[PDB]
PDB file of C-alpha atoms in Angstrom:
ATOM      1  CA  UNK A   1      -0.005  -0.378  -0.008  1.00  0.00           C
ATOM      2  CA  UNK A   2       1.042   3.161  -0.766  1.00  0.00           C
ATOM      3  CA  UNK A   3       2.502   5.719   1.637  1.00  0.00           C
ATOM      4  CA  UNK A   4       0.831   9.665   2.131  1.00  0.00           C
ATOM      5  CA  UNK A   5       2.174  11.673   3.375  1.00  0.00           C
ATOM      6  CA  UNK A   6       0.907  15.534   4.423  1.00  0.00           C
ATOM      7  CA  UNK A   7       2.560  19.104   3.963  1.00  0.00           C
ATOM      8  CA  UNK A   8       4.236  18.673   7.121  1.00  0.00           C
ATOM      9  CA  UNK A   9       6.472  15.717   5.484  1.00  0.00           C
ATOM     10  CA  UNK A  10       7.912  17.369   3.016  1.00  0.00           C
ATOM     11  CA  UNK A  11       8.126  20.992   4.125  1.00  0.00           C
ATOM     12  CA  UNK A  12       9.123  19.683   7.535  1.00  0.00           C
ATOM     13  CA  UNK A  13      12.626  18.984   5.121  1.00  0.00           C
ATOM     14  CA  UNK A  14      13.507  22.338   5.902  1.00  0.00           C
ATOM     15  CA  UNK A  15      12.019  22.804  10.043  1.00  0.00           C
ATOM     16  CA  UNK A  16      14.560  24.350  12.366  1.00  0.00           C
ATOM     17  CA  UNK A  17      13.818  21.460  15.128  1.00  0.00           C
ATOM     18  CA  UNK A  18      17.461  19.219  13.726  1.00  0.00           C
ATOM     19  CA  UNK A  19      14.645  16.499  15.068  1.00  0.00           C
ATOM     20  CA  UNK A  20      11.546  17.414  12.497  1.00  0.00           C
ATOM     21  CA  UNK A  21      14.105  17.692   9.540  1.00  0.00           C
ATOM     22  CA  UNK A  22      15.927  13.992  10.421  1.00  0.00           C
ATOM     23  CA  UNK A  23      13.018  12.301  10.530  1.00  0.00           C
ATOM     24  CA  UNK A  24      11.277  13.680   7.114  1.00  0.00           C
ATOM     25  CA  UNK A  25      14.619  13.626   5.508  1.00  0.00           C
ATOM     26  CA  UNK A  26      14.847   9.739   6.517  1.00  0.00           C
ATOM     27  CA  UNK A  27      11.523   8.613   5.321  1.00  0.00           C
ATOM     28  CA  UNK A  28      12.617  10.358   1.962  1.00  0.00           C
ATOM     29  CA  UNK A  29      15.080   8.822   2.217  1.00  0.00           C
ATOM     30  CA  UNK A  30      14.452   5.828   2.952  1.00  0.00           C
ATOM     31  CA  UNK A  31      11.441   6.283   0.222  1.00  0.00           C
ATOM     32  CA  UNK A  32      13.311   8.101  -3.607  1.00  0.00           C
ATOM     33  CA  UNK A  33      13.203   4.962  -4.668  1.00  0.00           C
ATOM     34  CA  UNK A  34       9.331   4.365  -4.054  1.00  0.00           C
ATOM     35  CA  UNK A  35       5.562   5.172  -4.526  1.00  0.00           C
ATOM     36  CA  UNK A  36       4.084   7.905  -1.934  1.00  0.00           C
ATOM     37  CA  UNK A  37       0.670   9.986  -2.512  1.00  0.00           C
ATOM     38  CA  UNK A  38      -0.058  13.406  -1.794  1.00  0.00           C
ATOM     39  CA  UNK A  39      -3.349  15.586  -2.112  1.00  0.00           C
ATOM     40  CA  UNK A  40      -3.558  18.381  -4.153  1.00  0.00           C
ATOM     41  CA  UNK A  41      -4.571  20.557  -0.906  1.00  0.00           C
ATOM     42  CA  UNK A  42      -1.135  19.207   0.364  1.00  0.00           C
ATOM     43  CA  UNK A  43      -0.057  20.756  -2.260  1.00  0.00           C
ATOM     44  CA  UNK A  44      -1.720  23.696  -2.230  1.00  0.00           C
ATOM     45  CA  UNK A  45      -0.480  24.139   2.125  1.00  0.00           C
ATOM     46  CA  UNK A  46       3.190  24.540   0.426  1.00  0.00           C
ATOM     47  CA  UNK A  47       3.066  26.322  -1.803  1.00  0.00           C
ATOM     48  CA  UNK A  48       0.436  28.688   0.662  1.00  0.00           C
ATOM     49  CA  UNK A  49       3.948  28.539   2.914  1.00  0.00           C
ATOM     50  CA  UNK A  50       6.685  29.198   0.474  1.00  0.00           C
ATOM     51  CA  UNK A  51       5.116  32.549  -1.306  1.00  0.00           C
ATOM     52  CA  UNK A  52       4.954  34.364   1.628  1.00  0.00           C
ATOM     53  CA  UNK A  53       8.952  33.741   1.704  1.00  0.00           C
ATOM     54  CA  UNK A  54      10.933  36.837   0.455  1.00  0.00           C
ATOM     55  CA  UNK A  55      12.016  36.344  -3.727  1.00  0.00           C
ATOM     56  CA  UNK A  56      15.145  35.031  -2.741  1.00  0.00           C
ATOM     57  CA  UNK A  57      14.171  32.387  -0.204  1.00  0.00           C
ATOM     58  CA  UNK A  58      11.900  30.978  -3.348  1.00  0.00           C
ATOM     59  CA  UNK A  59      14.533  30.946  -5.218  1.00  0.00           C
ATOM     60  CA  UNK A  60      16.575  29.156  -3.575  1.00  0.00           C
ATOM     61  CA  UNK A  61      14.134  26.789  -2.874  1.00  0.00           C
ATOM     62  CA  UNK A  62      11.147  25.881  -5.185  1.00  0.00           C
ATOM     63  CA  UNK A  63      14.131  24.212  -7.377  1.00  0.00           C
ATOM     64  CA  UNK A  64      14.827  21.795  -5.087  1.00  0.00           C
ATOM     65  CA  UNK A  65      10.914  21.445  -4.453  1.00  0.00           C
ATOM     66  CA  UNK A  66       9.950  21.103  -8.294  1.00  0.00           C
ATOM     67  CA  UNK A  67      13.193  18.965  -8.961  1.00  0.00           C
ATOM     68  CA  UNK A  68      12.367  16.696  -6.634  1.00  0.00           C
ATOM     69  CA  UNK A  69       8.628  16.298  -7.721  1.00  0.00           C
ATOM     70  CA  UNK A  70       9.495  15.417 -10.424  1.00  0.00           C
ATOM     71  CA  UNK A  71      12.389  13.314 -10.716  1.00  0.00           C
ATOM     72  CA  UNK A  72      10.146  10.925  -8.131  1.00  0.00           C
ATOM     73  CA  UNK A  73       7.387   8.739  -7.989  1.00  0.00           C
ATOM     74  CA  UNK A  74       4.960  10.760  -5.694  1.00  0.00           C
ATOM     75  CA  UNK A  75       1.371  10.445  -6.860  1.00  0.00           C
ATOM     76  CA  UNK A  76      -0.513  13.453  -6.194  1.00  0.00           C
ATOM     77  CA  UNK A  77      -4.387  13.127  -6.654  1.00  0.00           C
ATOM     78  CA  UNK A  78      -7.359  14.191  -5.351  1.00  0.00           C
ATOM     79  CA  UNK A  79      -9.601  12.571  -3.214  1.00  0.00           C
ATOM     80  CA  UNK A  80     -12.378  10.803  -4.575  1.00  0.00           C
ATOM     81  CA  UNK A  81     -16.439  10.554  -2.831  1.00  0.00           C
ATOM     82  CA  UNK A  82     -15.651   7.836  -1.034  1.00  0.00           C
ATOM     83  CA  UNK A  83     -13.344   9.644   1.220  1.00  0.00           C
ATOM     84  CA  UNK A  84     -15.401  12.963   0.778  1.00  0.00           C
ATOM     85  CA  UNK A  85     -18.694  10.924   2.335  1.00  0.00           C
ATOM     86  CA  UNK A  86     -16.929   9.759   4.737  1.00  0.00           C
ATOM     87  CA  UNK A  87     -15.437  13.729   5.609  1.00  0.00           C
ATOM     88  CA  UNK A  88     -19.246  14.524   6.052  1.00  0.00           C
ATOM     89  CA  UNK A  89     -19.590  12.063   8.608  1.00  0.00           C
ATOM     90  CA  UNK A  90     -16.665  12.474  10.644  1.00  0.00           C
ATOM     91  CA  UNK A  91     -17.953  14.679  14.124  1.00  0.00           C
ATOM     92  CA  UNK A  92     -15.681  17.889  13.874  1.00  0.00           C
ATOM     93  CA  UNK A  93     -11.815  20.935  15.044  1.00  0.00           C
ATOM     94  CA  UNK A  94     -10.058  20.183  12.264  1.00  0.00           C
ATOM     95  CA  UNK A  95      -9.854  22.573   9.460  1.00  0.00           C
ATOM     96  CA  UNK A  96     -11.680  21.090   6.280  1.00  0.00           C
ATOM     97  CA  UNK A  97      -8.145  20.249   4.639  1.00  0.00           C
ATOM     98  CA  UNK A  98      -7.630  17.479   7.367  1.00  0.00           C
ATOM     99  CA  UNK A  99     -10.901  15.965   7.493  1.00  0.00           C
ATOM    100  CA  UNK A 100     -10.471  15.617   3.883  1.00  0.00           C
ATOM    101  CA  UNK A 101      -7.091  13.759   4.926  1.00  0.00           C
ATOM    102  CA  UNK A 102      -7.770  12.104   7.549  1.00  0.00           C
ATOM    103  CA  UNK A 103     -10.826  10.154   6.213  1.00  0.00           C
ATOM    104  CA  UNK A 104      -8.094   9.492   2.832  1.00  0.00           C
ATOM    105  CA  UNK A 105      -5.993   7.485   4.753  1.00  0.00           C
ATOM    106  CA  UNK A 106      -8.739   5.057   7.150  1.00  0.00           C
ATOM    107  CA  UNK A 107     -10.973   4.493   3.637  1.00  0.00           C
ATOM    108  CA  UNK A 108      -7.892   3.165   2.063  1.00  0.00           C
ATOM    109  CA  UNK A 109      -5.568   1.700   5.381  1.00  0.00           C
ATOM    110  CA  UNK A 110      -3.340   3.358   3.615  1.00  0.00           C
ATOM    111  CA  UNK A 111       0.469   3.746   5.546  1.00  0.00           C
ATOM    112  CA  UNK A 112       0.179   7.876   6.533  1.00  0.00           C
ATOM    113  CA  UNK A 113       3.316  10.342   7.885  1.00  0.00           C
ATOM    114  CA  UNK A 114       2.992  13.244   9.083  1.00  0.00           C
ATOM    115  CA  UNK A 115       4.507  16.058  11.552  1.00  0.00           C
ATOM    116  CA  UNK A 116       0.572  17.572  12.746  1.00  0.00           C
ATOM    117  CA  UNK A 117       0.308  17.195  16.349  1.00  0.00           C
ATOM    118  CA  UNK A 118      -3.769  17.387  16.057  1.00  0.00           C
ATOM    119  CA  UNK A 119      -3.078  14.329  13.555  1.00  0.00           C
ATOM    120  CA  UNK A 120      -0.798  12.470  15.919  1.00  0.00           C
ATOM    121  CA  UNK A 121      -3.242  12.329  18.102  1.00  0.00           C
ATOM    122  CA  UNK A 122      -5.666  11.052  16.938  1.00  0.00           C
ATOM    123  CA  UNK A 123      -7.286   6.954  18.101  1.00  0.00           C
ATOM    124  CA  UNK A 124      -8.705   6.552  14.148  1.00  0.00           C
ATOM    125  CA  UNK A 125      -4.964   7.120  12.919  1.00  0.00           C
ATOM    126  CA  UNK A 126      -2.733   5.554  15.430  1.00  0.00           C
ATOM    127  CA  UNK A 127      -3.623   2.576  13.111  1.00  0.00           C
ATOM    128  CA  UNK A 128      -2.274   3.878   9.897  1.00  0.00           C
ATOM    129  CA  UNK A 129       0.358   5.875  11.659  1.00  0.00           C
ATOM    130  CA  UNK A 130       3.454   4.864  11.107  1.00  0.00           C
ATOM    131  CA  UNK A 131       7.500   5.614  12.627  1.00  0.00           C
ATOM    132  CA  UNK A 132       8.971   8.140  10.309  1.00  0.00           C
ATOM    133  CA  UNK A 133      12.687   5.587   8.880  1.00  0.00           C
ATOM    134  CA  UNK A 134      15.992   6.700  10.141  1.00  0.00           C
ATOM    135  CA  UNK A 135      22.810  14.485   6.250  1.00  0.00           C
ATOM    136  CA  UNK A 136      23.195  12.594   2.075  1.00  0.00           C
ATOM    137  CA  UNK A 137      20.171  11.940   1.374  1.00  0.00           C
ATOM    138  CA  UNK A 138      18.843  11.856  -2.431  1.00  0.00           C
ATOM    139  CA  UNK A 139      20.365  10.931  -5.649  1.00  0.00           C
ATOM    140  CA  UNK A 140      23.796  13.919  -5.279  1.00  0.00           C
ATOM    141  CA  UNK A 141      21.667  17.288  -7.939  1.00  0.00           C
ATOM    142  CA  UNK A 142      19.663  16.691  -5.216  1.00  0.00           C
ATOM    143  CA  UNK A 143      21.005  16.311  -2.824  1.00  0.00           C
ATOM    144  CA  UNK A 144      23.224  19.799  -4.286  1.00  0.00           C
ATOM    145  CA  UNK A 145      19.500  21.423  -3.986  1.00  0.00           C
ATOM    146  CA  UNK A 146      18.544  20.287  -0.968  1.00  0.00           C
ATOM    147  CA  UNK A 147      20.741  21.750   0.524  1.00  0.00           C
ATOM    148  CA  UNK A 148      21.030  25.466  -1.782  1.00  0.00           C
ATOM    149  CA  UNK A 149      17.721  25.352  -0.477  1.00  0.00           C
ATOM    150  CA  UNK A 150      18.357  25.468   3.601  1.00  0.00           C
ATOM    151  CA  UNK A 151      18.795  28.668   3.854  1.00  0.00           C
ATOM    152  CA  UNK A 152      14.708  28.418   3.311  1.00  0.00           C
ATOM    153  CA  UNK A 153      13.054  27.484   7.427  1.00  0.00           C
ATOM    154  CA  UNK A 154      10.388  26.008   8.369  1.00  0.00           C
ATOM    155  CA  UNK A 155       8.424  25.730  12.140  1.00  0.00           C
ATOM    156  CA  UNK A 156       5.623  25.729  13.272  1.00  0.00           C
ATOM    157  CA  UNK A 157       3.851  28.802  12.938  1.00  0.00           C
ATOM    158  CA  UNK A 158       4.679  28.819   9.291  1.00  0.00           C
ATOM    159  CA  UNK A 159       2.195  25.989   9.845  1.00  0.00           C
ATOM    160  CA  UNK A 160       0.026  28.096  12.204  1.00  0.00           C
ATOM    161  CA  UNK A 161      -1.147  30.748  10.125  1.00  0.00           C
ATOM    162  CA  UNK A 162      -1.417  29.106   6.038  1.00  0.00           C
TER     163      UNK A 162
ATOM    164  CA  UNK B   1      -7.930  45.269   1.406  1.00  0.00           C
ATOM    165  CA  UNK B   2     -10.688  43.320   1.597  1.00  0.00           C
ATOM    166  CA  UNK B   3     -13.801  42.838  -0.262  1.00  0.00           C
ATOM    167  CA  UNK B   4     -17.277  41.449   0.553  1.00  0.00           C
ATOM    168  CA  UNK B   5     -17.279  40.439  -3.476  1.00  0.00           C
ATOM    169  CA  UNK B   6     -13.784  38.473  -3.268  1.00  0.00           C
ATOM    170  CA  UNK B   7     -12.714  37.325  -6.794  1.00  0.00           C
ATOM    171  CA  UNK B   8     -12.806  32.972  -7.293  1.00  0.00           C
ATOM    172  CA  UNK B   9     -10.111  31.601 -10.340  1.00  0.00           C
ATOM    173  CA  UNK B  10      -9.842  28.159 -10.515  1.00  0.00           C
ATOM    174  CA  UNK B  11      -6.956  26.583 -12.113  1.00  0.00           C
ATOM    175  CA  UNK B  12      -8.590  26.383 -15.794  1.00  0.00           C
ATOM    176  CA  UNK B  13      -8.347  30.136 -15.530  1.00  0.00           C
ATOM    177  CA  UNK B  14      -4.859  30.564 -13.352  1.00  0.00           C
ATOM    178  CA  UNK B  15      -3.395  27.422 -16.070  1.00  0.00           C
ATOM    179  CA  UNK B  16      -5.473  29.948 -19.285  1.00  0.00           C
ATOM    180  CA  UNK B  17      -2.722  31.959 -19.527  1.00  0.00           C
ATOM    181  CA  UNK B  18      -1.224  29.564 -21.171  1.00  0.00           C
ATOM    182  CA  UNK B  19      -3.305  27.345 -22.927  1.00  0.00           C
ATOM    183  CA  UNK B  20      -2.601  26.598 -26.504  1.00  0.00           C
ATOM    184  CA  UNK B  21      -5.783  28.340 -27.177  1.00  0.00           C
ATOM    185  CA  UNK B  22      -5.198  31.630 -27.647  1.00  0.00           C
ATOM    186  CA  UNK B  23      -8.708  32.701 -26.861  1.00  0.00           C
ATOM    187  CA  UNK B  24      -8.768  30.850 -23.328  1.00  0.00           C
ATOM    188  CA  UNK B  25      -5.653  32.116 -23.203  1.00  0.00           C
ATOM    189  CA  UNK B  26      -6.088  36.331 -23.895  1.00  0.00           C
ATOM    190  CA  UNK B  27      -9.685  36.211 -21.820  1.00  0.00           C
ATOM    191  CA  UNK B  28      -7.304  34.409 -18.780  1.00  0.00           C
ATOM    192  CA  UNK B  29      -4.369  37.506 -19.304  1.00  0.00           C
ATOM    193  CA  UNK B  30      -7.574  39.708 -19.720  1.00  0.00           C
ATOM    194  CA  UNK B  31      -8.591  38.268 -15.962  1.00  0.00           C
ATOM    195  CA  UNK B  32      -5.838  38.465 -14.347  1.00  0.00           C
ATOM    196  CA  UNK B  33      -4.712  42.522 -16.023  1.00  0.00           C
ATOM    197  CA  UNK B  34      -7.929  43.212 -14.764  1.00  0.00           C
ATOM    198  CA  UNK B  35      -7.460  41.841 -11.726  1.00  0.00           C
ATOM    199  CA  UNK B  36      -4.099  41.783 -10.361  1.00  0.00           C
ATOM    200  CA  UNK B  37      -4.216  44.965  -8.262  1.00  0.00           C
ATOM    201  CA  UNK B  38      -7.270  42.944  -6.597  1.00  0.00           C
ATOM    202  CA  UNK B  39      -8.031  40.918  -4.885  1.00  0.00           C
ATOM    203  CA  UNK B  40      -8.770  36.872  -6.028  1.00  0.00           C
ATOM    204  CA  UNK B  41      -9.449  33.271  -3.948  1.00  0.00           C
ATOM    205  CA  UNK B  42      -8.006  30.111  -4.565  1.00  0.00           C
ATOM    206  CA  UNK B  43      -8.295  27.029  -2.859  1.00  0.00           C
ATOM    207  CA  UNK B  44      -5.262  25.126  -1.860  1.00  0.00           C
ATOM    208  CA  UNK B  45      -7.164  22.542  -4.152  1.00  0.00           C
ATOM    209  CA  UNK B  46      -5.875  23.933  -6.569  1.00  0.00           C
ATOM    210  CA  UNK B  47      -3.085  25.581  -6.078  1.00  0.00           C
ATOM    211  CA  UNK B  48      -2.279  21.632  -6.412  1.00  0.00           C
ATOM    212  CA  UNK B  49      -3.795  20.832  -9.830  1.00  0.00           C
ATOM    213  CA  UNK B  50      -1.992  23.799 -11.352  1.00  0.00           C
ATOM    214  CA  UNK B  51       1.542  21.938 -10.409  1.00  0.00           C
ATOM    215  CA  UNK B  52       0.610  18.787 -10.762  1.00  0.00           C
ATOM    216  CA  UNK B  53      -0.318  19.617 -14.543  1.00  0.00           C
ATOM    217  CA  UNK B  54       3.226  21.578 -14.791  1.00  0.00           C
ATOM    218  CA  UNK B  55       5.154  18.124 -12.277  1.00  0.00           C
ATOM    219  CA  UNK B  56       4.973  16.088 -15.406  1.00  0.00           C
ATOM    220  CA  UNK B  57       6.213  18.654 -18.444  1.00  0.00           C
ATOM    221  CA  UNK B  58       9.716  18.685 -18.778  1.00  0.00           C
ATOM    222  CA  UNK B  59      12.156  19.626 -16.257  1.00  0.00           C
ATOM    223  CA  UNK B  60      12.979  22.926 -18.976  1.00  0.00           C
ATOM    224  CA  UNK B  61       9.773  23.379 -19.504  1.00  0.00           C
ATOM    225  CA  UNK B  62       9.505  23.521 -15.520  1.00  0.00           C
ATOM    226  CA  UNK B  63      12.085  25.648 -15.390  1.00  0.00           C
ATOM    227  CA  UNK B  64      11.505  28.713 -17.576  1.00  0.00           C
ATOM    228  CA  UNK B  65       7.665  27.762 -16.709  1.00  0.00           C
ATOM    229  CA  UNK B  66       7.080  28.460 -12.661  1.00  0.00           C
ATOM    230  CA  UNK B  67       9.387  31.320 -12.056  1.00  0.00           C
ATOM    231  CA  UNK B  68       6.059  34.202 -13.434  1.00  0.00           C
ATOM    232  CA  UNK B  69       3.825  31.356 -11.811  1.00  0.00           C
ATOM    233  CA  UNK B  70       5.969  32.013  -8.537  1.00  0.00           C
ATOM    234  CA  UNK B  71       6.281  36.123 -10.053  1.00  0.00           C
ATOM    235  CA  UNK B  72       2.627  36.298  -9.867  1.00  0.00           C
ATOM    236  CA  UNK B  73       1.543  34.335  -6.900  1.00  0.00           C
ATOM    237  CA  UNK B  74       4.187  36.936  -4.221  1.00  0.00           C
ATOM    238  CA  UNK B  75       3.567  40.444  -6.086  1.00  0.00           C
ATOM    239  CA  UNK B  76      -0.335  39.836  -6.668  1.00  0.00           C
ATOM    240  CA  UNK B  77      -2.720  39.321  -3.697  1.00  0.00           C
ATOM    241  CA  UNK B  78      -3.978  36.055  -4.240  1.00  0.00           C
ATOM    242  CA  UNK B  79      -6.244  34.779  -0.712  1.00  0.00           C
ATOM    243  CA  UNK B  80      -4.806  30.548  -0.657  1.00  0.00           C
ATOM    244  CA  UNK B  81      -7.045  29.472   1.941  1.00  0.00           C
ATOM    245  CA  UNK B  82      -8.982  26.178   2.213  1.00  0.00           C
ATOM    246  CA  UNK B  83     -12.638  26.039   2.468  1.00  0.00           C
ATOM    247  CA  UNK B  84     -14.596  25.657   5.563  1.00  0.00           C
ATOM    248  CA  UNK B  85     -16.716  23.271   7.551  1.00  0.00           C
ATOM    249  CA  UNK B  86     -20.589  24.764   6.224  1.00  0.00           C
ATOM    250  CA  UNK B  87     -18.962  24.149   2.388  1.00  0.00           C
ATOM    251  CA  UNK B  88     -17.677  20.485   2.841  1.00  0.00           C
ATOM    252  CA  UNK B  89     -21.537  20.044   4.225  1.00  0.00           C
ATOM    253  CA  UNK B  90     -22.493  21.161   1.307  1.00  0.00           C
ATOM    254  CA  UNK B  91     -20.003  19.653  -0.502  1.00  0.00           C
ATOM    255  CA  UNK B  92     -21.416  16.350   0.638  1.00  0.00           C
ATOM    256  CA  UNK B  93     -25.940  17.571   0.939  1.00  0.00           C
ATOM    257  CA  UNK B  94     -25.200  18.283  -3.085  1.00  0.00           C
ATOM    258  CA  UNK B  95     -26.707  15.530  -4.776  1.00  0.00           C
ATOM    259  CA  UNK B  96     -26.747  16.508  -8.407  1.00  0.00           C
ATOM    260  CA  UNK B  97     -22.412  17.181  -8.175  1.00  0.00           C
ATOM    261  CA  UNK B  98     -21.634  12.930  -8.003  1.00  0.00           C
ATOM    262  CA  UNK B  99     -19.883  14.139 -11.293  1.00  0.00           C
ATOM    263  CA  UNK B 100     -17.575  16.260 -10.345  1.00  0.00           C
ATOM    264  CA  UNK B 101     -14.340  15.373  -8.234  1.00  0.00           C
ATOM    265  CA  UNK B 102     -14.379  15.998  -4.696  1.00  0.00           C
ATOM    266  CA  UNK B 103     -12.292  18.702  -5.184  1.00  0.00           C
ATOM    267  CA  UNK B 104     -14.113  20.251  -8.017  1.00  0.00           C
ATOM    268  CA  UNK B 105     -17.642  19.751  -5.316  1.00  0.00           C
ATOM    269  CA  UNK B 106     -15.947  21.884  -2.760  1.00  0.00           C
ATOM    270  CA  UNK B 107     -15.606  24.380  -5.215  1.00  0.00           C
ATOM    271  CA  UNK B 108     -18.876  24.696  -6.600  1.00  0.00           C
ATOM    272  CA  UNK B 109     -20.398  24.785  -2.588  1.00  0.00           C
ATOM    273  CA  UNK B 110     -17.483  27.242  -1.718  1.00  0.00           C
ATOM    274  CA  UNK B 111     -18.882  29.361  -4.488  1.00  0.00           C
ATOM    275  CA  UNK B 112     -22.992  28.849  -4.068  1.00  0.00           C
ATOM    276  CA  UNK B 113     -22.522  28.670  -0.258  1.00  0.00           C
ATOM    277  CA  UNK B 114     -20.374  32.571   0.002  1.00  0.00           C
ATOM    278  CA  UNK B 115     -22.048  33.445  -3.324  1.00  0.00           C
ATOM    279  CA  UNK B 116     -19.469  34.623  -4.739  1.00  0.00           C
ATOM    280  CA  UNK B 117     -17.741  35.720  -8.152  1.00  0.00           C
ATOM    281  CA  UNK B 118     -16.596  33.235 -10.101  1.00  0.00           C
ATOM    282  CA  UNK B 119     -14.063  32.830 -12.771  1.00  0.00           C
ATOM    283  CA  UNK B 120     -14.048  29.119 -15.182  1.00  0.00           C
ATOM    284  CA  UNK B 121     -13.408  27.721 -17.985  1.00  0.00           C
ATOM    285  CA  UNK B 122     -14.603  24.152 -17.198  1.00  0.00           C
ATOM    286  CA  UNK B 123     -17.320  23.660 -18.418  1.00  0.00           C
ATOM    287  CA  UNK B 124     -18.414  20.777 -16.496  1.00  0.00           C
ATOM    288  CA  UNK B 125     -19.000  23.867 -14.260  1.00  0.00           C
ATOM    289  CA  UNK B 126     -20.184  26.912 -16.130  1.00  0.00           C
ATOM    290  CA  UNK B 127     -23.562  24.415 -17.055  1.00  0.00           C
ATOM    291  CA  UNK B 128     -24.651  24.043 -12.844  1.00  0.00           C
ATOM    292  CA  UNK B 129     -27.610  26.264 -12.567  1.00  0.00           C
ATOM    293  CA  UNK B 130     -26.358  26.523  -9.044  1.00  0.00           C
ATOM    294  CA  UNK B 131     -23.465  28.293 -10.148  1.00  0.00           C
ATOM    295  CA  UNK B 132     -24.686  30.258 -13.459  1.00  0.00           C
ATOM    296  CA  UNK B 133     -26.093  33.564 -10.699  1.00  0.00           C
ATOM    297  CA  UNK B 134     -22.560  34.038  -9.608  1.00  0.00           C
ATOM    298  CA  UNK B 135     -20.942  33.077 -12.735  1.00  0.00           C
ATOM    299  CA  UNK B 136     -18.891  36.314 -14.430  1.00  0.00           C
ATOM    300  CA  UNK B 137     -18.102  37.586 -17.952  1.00  0.00           C
ATOM    301  CA  UNK B 138     -14.458  37.418 -18.246  1.00  0.00           C
ATOM    302  CA  UNK B 139     -13.494  41.328 -18.243  1.00  0.00           C
ATOM    303  CA  UNK B 140     -12.303  42.160 -21.723  1.00  0.00           C
ATOM    304  CA  UNK B 141      -9.411  40.519 -22.947  1.00  0.00           C
ATOM    305  CA  UNK B 142      -5.419  41.820 -22.393  1.00  0.00           C
ATOM    306  CA  UNK B 143       0.554  43.663 -22.420  1.00  0.00           C
ATOM    307  CA  UNK B 144      -0.944  43.707 -18.440  1.00  0.00           C
ATOM    308  CA  UNK B 145       2.205  43.006 -16.160  1.00  0.00           C
ATOM    309  CA  UNK B 146       4.633  45.731 -14.647  1.00  0.00           C
ATOM    310  CA  UNK B 147       7.602  45.368 -17.092  1.00  0.00           C
ATOM    311  CA  UNK B 148       9.596  42.275 -15.389  1.00  0.00           C
ATOM    312  CA  UNK B 149       6.825  39.849 -14.687  1.00  0.00           C
ATOM    313  CA  UNK B 150       6.397  40.373 -18.403  1.00  0.00           C
ATOM    314  CA  UNK B 151       8.589  39.194 -19.796  1.00  0.00           C
ATOM    315  CA  UNK B 152       8.873  36.759 -17.187  1.00  0.00           C
ATOM    316  CA  UNK B 153       5.362  35.227 -18.744  1.00  0.00           C
ATOM    317  CA  UNK B 154       7.224  35.697 -22.485  1.00  0.00           C
ATOM    318  CA  UNK B 155       9.977  33.072 -20.977  1.00  0.00           C
ATOM    319  CA  UNK B 156       7.230  30.808 -19.589  1.00  0.00           C
ATOM    320  CA  UNK B 157       5.526  31.384 -22.795  1.00  0.00           C
ATOM    321  CA  UNK B 158       7.781  27.937 -24.602  1.00  0.00           C
ATOM    322  CA  UNK B 159       4.971  26.253 -21.765  1.00  0.00           C
ATOM    323  CA  UNK B 160       1.163  25.481 -23.487  1.00  0.00           C
ATOM    324  CA  UNK B 161      -1.794  23.909 -21.416  1.00  0.00           C
ATOM    325  CA  UNK B 162      -4.028  21.770 -22.660  1.00  0.00           C
ATOM    326  CA  UNK B 163      -7.382  20.839 -22.475  1.00  0.00           C
ATOM    327  CA  UNK B 164      -6.913  17.080 -22.181  1.00  0.00           C
ATOM    328  CA  UNK B 165      -4.413  18.511 -19.551  1.00  0.00           C
ATOM    329  CA  UNK B 166      -6.961  19.238 -16.803  1.00  0.00           C
ATOM    330  CA  UNK B 167      -8.670  15.897 -17.549  1.00  0.00           C
ATOM    331  CA  UNK B 168      -4.953  13.643 -16.883  1.00  0.00           C
ATOM    332  CA  UNK B 169      -4.428  15.272 -13.497  1.00  0.00           C
TER     333      UNK B 169
END
């Protein structure tokens, strides 16, 4: 079953917390040769965070994000009807994107990776939450791009206000 | 400045700026020319659809395209947000949108719930009776950007978008 990630995993590669960054980088080192799913919404959240940064920071960061999405088999899709119906029957607290994301993970019983504390606490998600696998983690040129992009820093405040 | 009737666009309007059809392209450019200094709303999902389309293009085409998109999103006040709980509930209850994707259902629910002016090239949306009271005529068709962004746009025009690019995504 294909692994699901959200924007906190993707942007976590640039987190100011070294442990969060190590976890995100460990996931991508282990899954770069494999398949991963991100929703359209999770992709937009990433951009909405980045487009508020300086022109210089966007310029050094996006080449890394772009080559990663191109060279890695990241499956970018929307939610299906069954998932929408499940989200509306949920009782809650959580934004709409998060409810759809939870619905998608549960409906398809997919392994799920996330740094989002508001999702890691959810009993409904704990049978699908996976432990993050455990430096130089990409093919070399992507690694060069990542290094240049590390000027860009991501923190918990980025996700609160997007 | 915040507007009560903020204009809502979708990916077909944004990507329409690079449509292979010159007519569609002139209309989309006409839109961004008219709204460059105003508020416009795009959902996280519509933003993701634009990227999903582009990341299937060649490395070279992405590289000449994205500088235009990123500078536009930076310098224009495009309001990037998710949907609210009332919009989700409406998208589930609407029993006659089973033919549309989840994202389309949410987007139409957003427009209808908040009664917003909606711009789209998506024929599957323009026939929805509930949507017709909110569909807007595109401003007069189009150089519409400041000089630097204009140059980025012309470099980006090596990248062409097709009607079919919105089918696969």
